[PDB]
Amino acid sequence: SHTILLVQPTKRPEGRTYADYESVNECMEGVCKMYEEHLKRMNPNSPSITYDISQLFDFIDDLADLSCLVYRADTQTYQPYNKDWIKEKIYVLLRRQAQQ
Template sequence: MRIFIVKLQSSQILLVLIQGTLQKLSKGGFIHQSQGVVSQVLSIENLFLFVNSNYLHLLHINIKAHTILLVQPSSNPESRTYSDYESVNECMEGVCRIYEEHLKRRNPNTPTITYDISQLFDFVDQLSDLSCLVYQKSTNTYAPYNKDWIKEKIYILLRQAAGHEM
């Protein structure tokens, strides 16, 4: 089942596109029928539960989850820094800005700096440590995520940004 969030308003999901059908999300969820299979979509804040006769799927969407970025550029423990952001996407934009600042320092006389995602990912990989702590409201804790997770989220963010520019 392919699910796309179509419209957000004040961190609330209003519309969801499921297998080509636009669904309005009410407070309790909605029922979706496709090819004779009835699915029930239940929602509680940013937690979605998809139930049908074939499977049960749990999807957690962190729209506005406080995120702490931990960065250690070199093997020197004194190089450790952290930044905090209001959402995962803002944090991923912050990682891109860190790379852009790195490029500006290395190329101070270049007026316009361009890069592709593979260069950004190489930069991420060469950092001694890069990780995120994402707040989980349901448990009132922070969940840790590694470089691979960060690269996946950056890829999704940049893909979405490229789609909006078309």
């Protein structure tokens, strides 16, 4: 289902940005890639970045704002979800890819 991700890195309003995806899983992957890009910048000479779930969660907590909207066909509107919901959906995604 069409999912819209809203991100505000810091208190600076001009940093507000968004991205959209065909599904919740792709959106969650998008959040992970955002963190991975941050890690690449903080570890520039490392071609392979590794992290544990708690570190990604800490990153999300540090963002000034992170939320998403998921399309619901029953009402043809977008259901809002907060940081905690996103953290949990990322967990299920990462644990599944691990067991896959």
